[PDB]
Amino acid sequence: PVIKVRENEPFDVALRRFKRSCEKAGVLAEVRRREFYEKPTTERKRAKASAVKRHAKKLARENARRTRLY
Amino acid sequence: RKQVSDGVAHIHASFNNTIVTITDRQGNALGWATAGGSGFRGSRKSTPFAAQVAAERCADAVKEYGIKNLEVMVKGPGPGRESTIRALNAAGFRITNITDVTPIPHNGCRPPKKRRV
Amino acid sequence: PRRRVIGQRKILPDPKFGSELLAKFVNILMVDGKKSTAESIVYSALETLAQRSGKSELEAFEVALENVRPTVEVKSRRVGGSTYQVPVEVRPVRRNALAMRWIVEAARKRGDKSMALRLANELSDAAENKGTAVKKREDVHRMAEANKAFAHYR
RNA sequence: CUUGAGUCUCGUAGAGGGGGGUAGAAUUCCAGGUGUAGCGGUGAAAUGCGUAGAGAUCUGGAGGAAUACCGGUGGCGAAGGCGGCCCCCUGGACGAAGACUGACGCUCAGGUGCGAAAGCGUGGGGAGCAAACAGGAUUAGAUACCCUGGUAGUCCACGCCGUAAACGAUGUCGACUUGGAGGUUGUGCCCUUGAGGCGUGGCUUCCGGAGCUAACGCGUUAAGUCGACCGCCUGGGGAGUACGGCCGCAAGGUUAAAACUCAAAUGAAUUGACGGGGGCCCGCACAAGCGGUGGAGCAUGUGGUUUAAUUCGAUGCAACGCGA
């Protein structure tokens, strides 16, 4: 996440760009995940859970949440 | 005794501690400071505020060298990662470039085992 | 409470000087619902203080308060299972109340004979900034400074 | 005879397998520069490392292992499994049109092969991690969880072992039976007018009808309707154990009982209760405050002890100035 502060760019603005760049890159997330060894089985299981939850939630929202709530 | 005007601020921001190190553009270190040496231990040195005061201390230390421009290289996942740069700017350097140099492997060495807490 | 933003209650101003702050001080001082006695003590203390230090009763009293109010106190935020002492800026009504409370406690402690005498001495000390209530404020501030790392991470 | 089964022609996608090179990032170590008192770690510490100059930072070098992003309920494989890039050898699947053989097929007890990880033998290698082990914490203890270290092992070659919740807890092969939304990979036509319209194959994910099921659920990839063959079960424990056999260097694997003992053991779902589950909410529940009790004397009640009797009852909150 390289940033160079442009001419007449405020510092706060520069900081904002830097943070955005880092978030987009996903550096913190990568480091956190690589902090400890996740077993392959654990990684697979987590992936499966994420996929299932995401799919179920999407289905519930779009199709199940098409009714009169009140 | 020497003057350089333009330095690099290497902000090593681990979870436990923040190390700030001002250096010449080549790599040679001028002054450093940590939250530990800044007077914070444990829960207090693992905070953004501690990082900020460490940064202030570092700036004071390298005041002899008369550094005016400064590019900051942030490393690691840390509570500071922002406080240090804010503090440095307040201490009054022109921040020119801000770069992240956190070392991610390309699936290399095995990490240590997961903590059971 | 859980579900209450109750209205602050009405305190009448003291008859001699017409001051709400002074009335509150008298209330804090009072014990056993004996208001008359408390007001007599407060007035005696004020009169002595005015004579000793200067200008008026209310101005002297204010000066003492200024030297004994705390800007910041600490609370114990208990979120991560352990308790962090966090600093917090003390709002004005609390600042006055806390300062008054500290002053009265210090006066009660103090070794002079009459209550009025103790109060007058304590107030004068506060004005100078070498007394015990002031010491208490200093201690509170010292703690806040120590725990400044936990200020805006509650 | 050609519809099952196979052969040939042309393409397609693929972490399918075996061998050999190579790339960059990162960790470790080594040497050197800068530089100075801390670093590391945790809930908090300490062990550990550092003024014999560490950690930080730049340069160079060594070496091992693994391939970020792409990356996907994506793909390939009989399963186990397979993930940087390049080459060499190599197996299968699928589609298109035809041509060919002419039931050549399905299943399979014994048998044979393949078979994660750990483990074993011999010879290498060894960065990181890490059983064992050591020290520091925590604790009533802590032969654990946490921390700092750390050896087998993890890697390579070649042998062995032969097991896993080796799971879809679902044997293989074939036929038939309403649908919807996707993914992936072919292919025919439509002007691809654009990413696009209508088909037709393969594999694949979810939802759901009839039907089935104890229910949960399955539902054209069946747990539906059927046919062929195999494997396996017959209450819980004893026990996948003993003995015998076979196999193995060993660890052990495989085959596999009996006495004795009980009247249950189990599956799914229901209503509660409970959770050091989750969401929302209240109450002097905490918080903010004020005043007490626990120390003293005395009053009173209780326990106890004493007594001839110390009447009987109340005795976690919700008995103890209570019946009185």
Ligand SMILES: [Mg+2]
């Ligand atoms: Mg660790």
Ligand SMILES: [Mg+2]
């Ligand atoms: Mg391939």
Ligand SMILES: [Mg+2]
């Ligand atoms: Mg295939």
Ligand SMILES: [Mg+2]
């Ligand atoms: Mg067999």
Ligand SMILES: [Mg+2]
């Ligand atoms: Mg192995």
Ligand SMILES: [Mg+2]
């Ligand atoms: Mg070996």
Ligand SMILES: [Mg+2]
């Ligand atoms: Mg060996």
Ligand SMILES: [Mg+2]
């Ligand atoms: Mg280790």
Ligand SMILES: [Mg+2]
């Ligand atoms: Mg360990």
Ligand SMILES: [Mg+2]
């Ligand atoms: Mg088995």
Ligand SMILES: [Mg+2]
């Ligand atoms: Mg498996």
Ligand SMILES: [Mg+2]
């Ligand atoms: Mg089985």
Ligand SMILES: [Mg+2]
């Ligand atoms: Mg077969």
Ligand SMILES: [Mg+2]
């Ligand atoms: Mg279904």
Ligand SMILES: [Mg+2]
């Ligand atoms: Mg029996």
Ligand SMILES: [Mg+2]
């Ligand atoms: Mg056996």
